[PDB]
Amino acid sequence: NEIPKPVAPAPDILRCAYAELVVTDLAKSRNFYVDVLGLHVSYEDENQIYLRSFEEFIHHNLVLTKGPVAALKAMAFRVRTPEDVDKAEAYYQELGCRTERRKDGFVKGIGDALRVEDPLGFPYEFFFETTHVERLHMRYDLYSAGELVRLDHFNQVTPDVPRGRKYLEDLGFRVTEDIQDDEGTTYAAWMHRKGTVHDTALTGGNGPRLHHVAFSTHEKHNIIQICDKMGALRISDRIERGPGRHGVSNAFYLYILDPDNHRIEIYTQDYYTGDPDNPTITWNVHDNQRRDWWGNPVVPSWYTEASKVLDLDGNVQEIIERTDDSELEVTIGADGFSFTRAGDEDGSYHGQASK
Amino acid sequence: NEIPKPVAPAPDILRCAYAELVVTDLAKSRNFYVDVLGLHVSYEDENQIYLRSFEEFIHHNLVLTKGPVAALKAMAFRVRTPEDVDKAEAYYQELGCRTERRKDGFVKGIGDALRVEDPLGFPYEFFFETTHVERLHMRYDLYSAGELVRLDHFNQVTPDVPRGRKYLEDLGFRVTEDIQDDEGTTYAAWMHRKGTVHDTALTGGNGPRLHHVAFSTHEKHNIIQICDKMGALRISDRIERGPGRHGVSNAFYLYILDPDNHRIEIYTQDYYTGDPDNPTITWNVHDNQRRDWWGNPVVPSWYTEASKVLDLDGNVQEIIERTDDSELEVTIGADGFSFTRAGDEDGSYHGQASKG
Amino acid sequence: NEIPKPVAPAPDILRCAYAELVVTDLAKSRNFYVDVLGLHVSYEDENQIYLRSFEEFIHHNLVLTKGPVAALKAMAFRVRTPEDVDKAEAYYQELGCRTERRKDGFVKGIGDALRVEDPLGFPYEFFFETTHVERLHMRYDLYSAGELVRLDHFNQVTPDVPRGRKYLEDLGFRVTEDIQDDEGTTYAAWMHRKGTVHDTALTGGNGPRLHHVAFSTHEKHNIIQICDKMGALRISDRIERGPGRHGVSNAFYLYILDPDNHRIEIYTQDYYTGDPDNPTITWNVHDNQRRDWWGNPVVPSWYTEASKVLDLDGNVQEIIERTDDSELEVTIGADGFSFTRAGDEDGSYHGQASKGFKLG
Amino acid sequence: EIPKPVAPAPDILRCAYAELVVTDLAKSRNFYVDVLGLHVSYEDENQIYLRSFEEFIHHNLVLTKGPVAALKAMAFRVRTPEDVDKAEAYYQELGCRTERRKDGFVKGIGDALRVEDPLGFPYEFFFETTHVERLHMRYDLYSAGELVRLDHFNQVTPDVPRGRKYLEDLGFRVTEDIQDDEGTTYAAWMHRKGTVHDTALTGGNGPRLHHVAFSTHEKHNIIQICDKMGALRISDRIERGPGRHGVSNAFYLYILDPDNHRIEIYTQDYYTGDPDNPTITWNVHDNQRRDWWGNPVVPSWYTEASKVLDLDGNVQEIIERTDDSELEVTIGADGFSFTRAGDEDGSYHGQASKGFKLG
């Protein structure tokens, strides 16, 4: 059942670059991503909105495409050279995956691009060529109190984390942190190319589903302001979880829900991982500071809800149920538990979440 | 039932000044307030620790007094003149309250002071005279990433909020914000002298009990650091609620628990209330943004748990039960309700707390 | 030349409330205060713009009034009761000052108001009645990265600081901080009613002139953002001084210049002064951490330039020259001196400013 | 011209640490540990080894007691052990003096190569290093001014294009630079790790070390360092700032250690890891290029820098810049700068911005 390593060389992946999300009401989505969140328009028409963060120079970090069923259509990684698109094609072909190459791109402002149904059922895109736009990094006349400054990562729900981890490691992603138990189950892994804690991450669950797309801010007060704004707009019900400090990654975070329930994380101030012997951190699944360092409870919807993903024909990918133990069940379910201090019943929670 | 307005003039109260808290293990409490929270020691011996915030010049903002039963011993307000302590004494005597006056103070660093058992059963102190100490407001060589800069307010649990409110208004406190419902019930009120949202507040519940004492920080990141530090110390279980943004008050906040479960709020960035026609804001009790503006749920312990208070002899005040509706029950209990948008079923909660 | 204490009781002043500035080009001024700084419009027409801060509930904190000569037309203080406007009139009449009373106000959204040519030549207004507006304190859908949240203070240039200080003390302002030297000269004083470091302040120099109006932010990053935005708009030449940490007041600060060179300070995180025995802090004029705690030099324009003020007829008040020693001259001038550490030659400056600079 | 070797360049990850010679170890310890809050990895009577809050390698700064304060080595970590062999072959082909120590020059570094590079600078290349407790979640230690990473070095060298070409051959990519309309280069910034820079060249007499830079999380952390220095009554050791840079867009501060070694505190520059990352060239007369808010650049910033040592520990001879001086063309008596290109309003002629002339 393992995914064999191709003999063909892996493409040299720089970073996560953009996501294409199918949305059902383009105007409602535009209000969320432009008016609430302040992303910058790179192109729009009656069918699509192309958006970028404050410090981006490539054409976009987010494409909103009107469609009948809300879903992730592609999660796109930029590769180092044009020849790396050829490498990506040969690599996935050797893996036995369905691939589609468009020499003029799938979306505006991207050139030669390869989309694939990857071995975990996810629609990945690889591209080098992209239309450069004005880098807005010093446009403080446009800067919002909640400004989103970079695209940081994706998070994928998949049933077998070790299987997916090994596949991503072969593609050159390096694991930085993970969550395990003493019995040897892996519940989640984080992995990177660009020298932050992650470009993508695997959350154990029924999949393929897209858990979230994450944008960063400069400072913690910028995340606070997003929350404050949502309260002023009386859409606080769309704040799912946070704001908090993560255990894994050490980042300050917030999770919010778009009009189609696509989950967006806002994230800041993780650490440098670019050294090849970067120390890998393993948390125990029962540690109540692993996800929220302050011990705040993880709402069940965070574990159970995630976005559909599409195949290359635009149809929804069938889901495979996780057979490994469930993080939700072992921590906050009827027979779950967590601790503040390992071995101490004081500050422990049994069959219950924290707080 | 109503508390009459005295003929005697009310004392001119400046602000909340300090609390004296009884604690059971002086060493454990010191470690919390000094090592974890960073408050500054004005004086300490084997029985008491006198602590002050970064910007304070009066002797202290907090006195920890070792004793057998953890409780509030005195909540103190400073008055404008020495003659206002005379006014306070005559005022509470007309109210028929027990009073006790000491020209040399009850605690170190306070001179002529009046303590009273007020009409709600709380131990109030009024004083003018205090020993000035080094104001540490520019001692950035001492400044902590979580620095507590000022004492901001107290919050009192009392069963009948309107009764208490009228009494505090006659005493010169002005109501800035409150929480009511559509059936004539008041659940909470905030009231001030110094021109911030409050110097004290009333929370409807069984009482007298002390809900919390609140200290300010300069910035929101200072509150975040307190949380981060508690995680590093592996004492995140002592974070009760927050961090968040309040609806009422608009302040950024955090609630933590000391070793005797006394609740401390960290608070920043409320607004100016010093004009006498300052607009009074009333929230509906079912508005899920009233306590946490982001809609985060209020944990039941925040409603049910609070500190004992002492009388002037040092004995615990008997608790009188609230008969008015319970904010817990009407918002997050089995028959509770809250809304995100008034009149919208979407984003409303029936018989449970927000966010799952 | 002491100003006597009246027998008539002083009005009970709450706080500074608004300033009326005469501006020469209303559109250019609106661009600065609304588009650059983010203040909120309460009312406007062809002649005036009425602006308020994020947390204000009275009608306005600033009125911009088109006129031929840019100047301060009124610094306004709110009093506690309607009766305090009568008290103000009686008080200033006893002081021998010219006064003008308008039962329906001088500017929109203010009711019964008294304006006075005060003993230092400044146009003060006292009022209680004002039209309440929507308080925007939780309108985070409007909140700017540089949001101005309150009006904090005024600062006045006057030739004789002790004379003015005594008069303001009789009026009920308490001095929180001052700058003096060891030879009896007062260079500046800060004084309050509302329980912050100040509602107004006196800066020694030729006057009457208005030094600045100050607005506060929530946090230091908000002030940084104003600077950053001015850079992006390529108007960094309108940043006069800062950003910095003050010694006096301990506030984080920035000084900028509007289209008519009216100086605006942005300010945050001073301390509580409401207790009646609040300790008064006196800094020595030669302490190089007194104005900028980090030792950064005070640009000469900060000491020399300030706005004209008008009398009740709208004519510019004549300027009276300061004869006391000049803060500029004694610190950064040719015979000037400043220290980092009292009594240490190392980190001291002789005949020049700090950090490697001299007067242009 | 410095030729491109046939031998492959070592794969450089990032700047890693500097070794600074200091004259009074206790006074230097007070500055770096007590004032700035850096974390001790090792110390004795001869040296102090210091790391930032988020570091896992042994150290980011070695303070070595010696007779003459100077930079002794600026060290870059390479990707594999074999890259140290590549460094050695590369610099030997360049004709540079090299010294190889299989067990390191300083504690907590293993196999290492030091070289006197073509610009006169003592560079070290290493892979092997002793891992230590990564303190990134130790909020019980976190100070209000916490220094979280080593970010970069800045080198003073007389001929910027000559140095830039050599660094490009070594794999560094230019992100930003400062030039004039007549083709003079005043400064260039260049990176390996995907930030604006790992090292930078400032036109001037050299070799000299301009500064070492550490990062903070947020801008308020830099403000606190200034506030703390005021409280300690050492504001005279704040040289320049705080400010926002034009070049790099980072929030910054420059301070001076007890031997006048300049330390920058820096935060919130941008991502440069894509290979077609857009370069940005600023005009030397643009008064927003160094401080975005137009604050004047203090003359000492342009004239003063640290000595550097050769592999024997002797001070490297200084070679004079012959290209135009940035100080002179901008803030000297014949200099000029502008706020808006072509606008006399907001321009400065023969003095610095904001009303000052040179002291």
Ligand SMILES: O=[N+]([O-])c1ccc(O)c(O)c1
């Ligand atoms: O600790 N977890 O909950 C994490 C850590 C990093 C992330 O970006 C995330 O989405 C989850």
Ligand SMILES: O=[N+]([O-])c1ccc(O)c(O)c1
């Ligand atoms: O803009 N300059 O002054 C710069 C920009 C970045 C730096 O790291 C520096 O030392 C100077």
Ligand SMILES: [Ca+2]
């Ligand atoms: Ca003298």
Ligand SMILES: [Cl-]
């Ligand atoms: Cl609340």
Ligand SMILES: [Cl-]
């Ligand atoms: Cl000043």
Ligand SMILES: [Fe+2]
């Ligand atoms: Fe994430």
Ligand SMILES: [Fe+2]
């Ligand atoms: Fe409170």
Ligand SMILES: [Fe+2]
């Ligand atoms: Fe001011």
Ligand SMILES: [Fe+2]
């Ligand atoms: Fe630098």
